[PDB]
Design a protein that fits this description.
Two copies of one chain form a homodimer. The first copy, chain A, is of the alpha/beta class and 201 residues long. Chain A has two domains: 2-18 and 70-201, HAD superfamily/HAD-like (Rossmann fold); 19-69, 434 Repressor (Amino-terminal Domain). Helix content of chain A is 40%, strand content 16%. In chain A, the strands form two sheets. Chain A has a six-stranded parallel beta sheet, sandwiched between helices. A two-stranded antiparallel sheet of chain A has the order 2-3. In chain A, strand 4, helix 6 (97-106) and strand 5 form a beta-alpha-beta unit. In chain A, helix 5 runs parallel beside helix 9. In chain A, 40% of the residues are buried. Chain A binds chain B through residues 14-15, 19-20, 22, 26, 29-32, 40-41, 44, 48-64, 152-154, 171-174, 176-177, 186, and chain B through 14-15, 19-20, 22, 26, 29-32, 40-41, 44, 48-64, 152-154, 171-174, 176-177, 186.
Amino acid sequence: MSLSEIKHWVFDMDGTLTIAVHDFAAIREALSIPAEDDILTHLAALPADESAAKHAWLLEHERDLAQGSRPAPGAVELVRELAGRGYRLGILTRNARELAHVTLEAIGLADCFAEADVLGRDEAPPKPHPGGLLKLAEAWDVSPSRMVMVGDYRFDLDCGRAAGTRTVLVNLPDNPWPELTDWHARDCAQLRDLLSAEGHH
Amino acid sequence: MSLSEIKHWVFDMDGTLTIAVHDFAAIREALSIPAEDDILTHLAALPADESAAKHAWLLEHERDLAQGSRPAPGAVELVRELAGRGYRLGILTRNARELAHVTLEAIGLADCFAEADVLGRDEAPPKPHPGGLLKLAEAWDVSPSRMVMVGDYRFDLDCGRAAGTRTVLVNLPDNPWPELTDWHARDCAQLRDLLSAEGHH
């Protein structure tokens, strides 16, 4: 109802707490981007067919260009804020738990989640099946209506709706699935601001 | 020297002969693209920060949105033209051979390559190590100088240069690695045109 009244928070990993990063130097070389230009800005200014070919190449080679992941904007700050309140935090991800654990350690958030509450590939059916959120709801003995699922992709929102949890979209700037989305924020930093302000006027 | 004098052709698979395709309806929904607009054109017309957020999301979710692959523009036509001349054709790919074989069958090109000349994950060291092209050079008993490696990514061109083969870049519209690239074409269809015209005036 009010966001701050939710004391049980579940996050997706990829796209929500962490984001893939890519080899900028390799992109600039392949796409002939001048050093003085931003990659995206430069591509948007090119003739349409040239821009299209170069964007297609970039998407085609996303895995070739990837260089691991970094925390998403505001993600660390938001998780630390929630943990500081004594809120219960979980993860629901397609990633193997061991890989999720390693990622959490790398971004300095491993102490914010009980290990049993990090649900990976082997702990839950694939999204948008509700099983993983129900597992957390059971472990926490809490109404799903008093939980929030935080994600950046339609399967996260569908998973929340299927389990009966509230839903937050982060990491898109607008509200593309309004019926599936209880709150939306451009990123985890705006979400933390929303949390701070809502029902506190 | 003249492109038509090369009678031994090696292709990369991903990015050269086939390209990943993606779920347009899912992209349009997530990025709030109107039906009357092209996705890329619409994104380029958005305010800079909004465009940046949406392009980042698209790259982040490239694998989530993927729906297998299709032949790259002109790829089928080019391979059939070369096979029709009686030229010897090979593949050098990171993909498992069994997966490459299945892909070749799907795009109707399996009859254009001897099965032993399709080199996958288990048949050759990772690009840009020259081993795979040397394997083909040996099997064909041909000077690498009389072979061409066709690709769309720097490791393909580096692999060709390391083995001593000629090199072609396809599927980018310009010439970003001029010292690594013997011929360049926007796609396999322009390459087929180049083949047809060069040294024939």
